[PDB]
Symmetry: C5
């Protein structure tokens, strides 16, 4: 937590306020608590709404990934319930569904999905997927072809084909949703306004408290600053849900969970 | 929580007797800065509790869907296949097993007794062998529906109508699992929890100059309001958690089971 | 009975006025600043709570709105798809009407026996009353009517499905209402707020008297009224199926539903 | 806006407060700002949440009408894509769909729909619709009859019938949604509490401000009153989305847009 | 952001307050901080709710546009999966889908869609689209005709037609959603009340602060002014998500992405 640096900086500003409080009158500068209460409350209100937006975004990201697991579970269930004897098809479709999850992760992380794809799919399909400017989307197309062939071969009717196609649609909404969350952030002018106001507020605060608090200034000023900064920093942690950091989504573990689930449901 | 109130009373008594030595050291605590701090904390508690409440509401909605989806699936089975009571009973057993297994999964308790009560031991072994027992129960229910389809008893259309309900259930399973792995905040909530505590303990020292002897009464009142609101959010954030009220989840599982034995002629007594 | 607490608050103000003399001689001082902090905090919490209570009221109203919608369309489908099956129209409508009234009784915790006998043959009434969820049984019975039309070949699996969907929709309503009936907002929210607001309002004049003196009861009652009004409104909204003023006129709503369904089946009241 | 009357009344209350401030001590009345800050902030908080609720219902009303345009567009699109040669059926259904919109408009406005109906439908149908206690619902039923007849004639299969039947369902949800918004208001106790509280607050305020502000009382008091009154009055205007008031939904314009759209998609 | 003018103007009001504070008594003017704390906090609350509503519009607008990409992707996927050999139909339908996006953008931006339409479609079709008072809707209708013809030719069954028909409706919901956001703005009385109120508050503020702050008045007044003014103007920008401002939707980039996706590899699919 690099929050400690500005807390330390805040302690230093408090010490300056205490020793420089002498020259306050000799300059004509006074700072009371009342105007900073107004400012502080206004900032708290705006921080509240902002964090709310950051929170909703983090939650949606969690929701989208939850849907991958749900839709892939049911698609495999449908394949077993409707075509219990078609395990060759079971394995092929499962490999694509598993590939989709990993490919989505790599896409959001901007990493190379090549190794994971080669572990799951024949090289012909991997080349075919990587040739696309939108590889994760290309993967859905391939899963659709597998289902499409079962339809053409008469193993799936249009009805049962439709039941499985619906699940691919659910995955498509996940892909677009994540892509939307990745390119659209909470707008950058929310963060600038708040960062500029919060930092300036905390550093000016001890100068406004010193008249009332004297020697207790650094303790109370640090308490108030810590409160605003903790709340402000919470938004920063929630804003990067697809990242690698510790408070980011465990996408690797999630992908492993998805793969473990699908191989549990096909006897592998 | 009552303990932190008593601790707050002691801090007030300390504040009263130690207020004497304040000047000869130069330490001052006025109400205005703690008014600022208090209102900000209240605002954050408001928004935090709002998020917690949202999580609680979703958890109940998800569980309501279990009750709804299972009711209609059984209704469809009777309306579409009124004579297939062997199939009725087996599927009902899986749906009931699903609810209890879901409850046990979210509560991290042993589902063995409920499973052995409802299903033949062969399936219980199969379900317990899986790392995802609740999902396996859905898979087994799906097989029952799938077999009726191959026997020609269900068409693809009527199969699809029932298949949708298994989908209404899978979404619930994933939804609860997401709510279970949660919280969202990375235990930054702990900070927030502590912030309220430090505020309540520092409060009497800031009030004593104005309130004097009346300090412990007003200080404990304010503390009670903040601590209560904080603990309420804590309870709402974790609807499936370690220290939670299980009367609803248990009543719901009982309600679901009572309904399905109600819609399959197993109730009342002949 | 909020008027009682307003009158009681006036009395507490008078106590504050007459006892302000002995304030110094006891060692008690009460300033406004700490009570502004406490008061604003409570207002914030009342604000969020009241918002939640309203949402719950709106949802309950929505669910009942869906009953009217789904039942209208089910009857519409029956006439459009099976225009000659008027016996089936009548039986299904009677079940749909029974469903609404039964839902009302379930939410009001009252006896549906009289309404059921007015609408259905006694054999069906007994079957429905025997169930732990009579509304669910009514949906099941309505489902049998559609199911029997399907077995007779009058409905295909597709057209059966279109109607089965409306029964899905009613079930989703039943569960929603049930969820709202069994869930209150958590009690710890009403307990915190009701005790806290009351205690705050009665302690307030003791804190105001030093500034306001004789003007204490007027300002104290105004502030108390604002907080109490907002608090009591939330509790009424929290119980949308209850008897209190701003609750759902469920009886009128069921009458509306029944008149609608008899309008679309050529019957007159 | 009759708020200007209450602002002037507030200026009147301030001048009274100024001239009567003399007799304050001689009566035993003291009024400080602090208790009114508490009350004022509380009122603002409740006004904030209330206005939020009013805005949301206005938004729902607009959404419901948006759905009318969407569902009717696609129903007409479907009729054409599925039955391009059945123009007799096209016109009849379009007239019903247009009548539905106008009938809904008149219903929410509590006005007479007769001319709009007679302009769109043969008198034979109009009397039947007007004879019902629920004319808009009867129009959906009649639109349903047209689709049902196309099915019985074998022009629509059960599947394609179902595709259009779904659109009638969307319209049914709109009708119910609108009716609910019309009969259920934001509860009258939100208006009752807030108007009494806001008005009494604004009139009592100068008496509490005069001790501190004196001659500057009317300016600061009217500003505060204007802020609260404007925000309160905004909520009332939003609470009645189907009304005649300028900031209400342009339902007449919306119905014209719908009619123009459907006749645009039928070569009319 | 023209706030920089009003901030400098606020510095001007502060210097006036400082030099005239002596003459307060000689005029009969008294101004304390307390009433302006009340007024300021009320304004902050209302700004909070307003900005929240504005963001809500921004989020929905972004969602509607996201759906365009999703629905159009799956429609093409379905065409490839169900009719893998009908590439002539693929190309015609894709162009309509691409035309739909650009036409929607121009409609919301009130610009001329002629150039984009001629780039994607034959002139005969362009005139038909331009002849309609609602070109975006006409494009969906034409895309619908393509699907409808494949059905009449026996290439699509009623079932598979329906699967694709559903996606066109999804696009219709986007079109209606955007039009609602475009034709209905937030009520004009939100901008009127708040802009006047915030500005008047910020300029009057230093006159009330000078008694406490003296020489520090311009610094604190501009700080408070920046906070209120920034939040207000951002709200203004987000309320018009289809506008040209910098915190608005990059509609041009979005349409390019949609076109690139559907025309990913000269329309080549496996
Ligand atoms: Zn799903
Ligand atoms: Zn297999
Ligand atoms: Zn990160
Ligand atoms: Zn049975
Ligand atoms: Zn029973
Ligand atoms: Zn419906
Ligand atoms: Zn009939
Ligand atoms: Zn359902
Ligand atoms: Zn639609
Ligand atoms: Zn035509
Ligand atoms: Zn003709
Ligand atoms: Zn008339
Ligand atoms: Zn979609
Ligand atoms: Zn192609
Ligand atoms: Zn000065």
């Amino acid at each position: 937590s690099k929050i400690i640096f500005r807390l330390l900086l805040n302690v230093l500003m408090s010490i300056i306020a205490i020793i420089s409080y002498q020259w306050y009158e000799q300059l004509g500068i006074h700072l009371t608590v009342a105007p900073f209460s107004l400012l502080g409350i206004a900032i708290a209100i705006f921080l509240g709404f902002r964090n709310s937006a950051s929170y909703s975004r983090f939650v949606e990201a969690r929701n989208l990934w939850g849907t991958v697991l749900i839709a892939e579970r049911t698609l495999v269930r449908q394949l077993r319930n409707i075509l219990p004897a078609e395990h060759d098809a079971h394995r092929r479709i499962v490999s694509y569904l598993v590939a989709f999850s990993w490919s989505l992760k790599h896409q959001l992380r901007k990493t190379d999905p090549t190794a994971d794809l080669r572990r799951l799919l024949p090289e012909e399909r991997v080349t075919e997927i990587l040739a696309s400017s939108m590889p994760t989307n290309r993967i859905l197309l391939l899963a659709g072809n597998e289902i499409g062939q079962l339809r053409e071969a008469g193993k799936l009717s249009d009805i049962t084909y439709g039941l499985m196609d619906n699940k691919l649609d659910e995955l498509a909404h996940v892909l677009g949703g994540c892509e939307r969350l990745a390119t659209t952030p909470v707008p950058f002018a929310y963060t600038l306004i708040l960062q500029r106001t919060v930092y300036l507020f905390c550093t000016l605060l001890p100068f406004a408290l010193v008249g009332d608090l004297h020697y207790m200034t650094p303790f109370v000023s640090v308490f108030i600053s810590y409160t605003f900064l903790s709340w402000d920093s919470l938004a920063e942690e929630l804003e990067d849900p697809f990242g690698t950091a510790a408070n980011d989504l465990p996408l690797n573990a999630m992908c492993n969970t998805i793969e473990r689930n699908l191989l549990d449901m096909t006897g592998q």
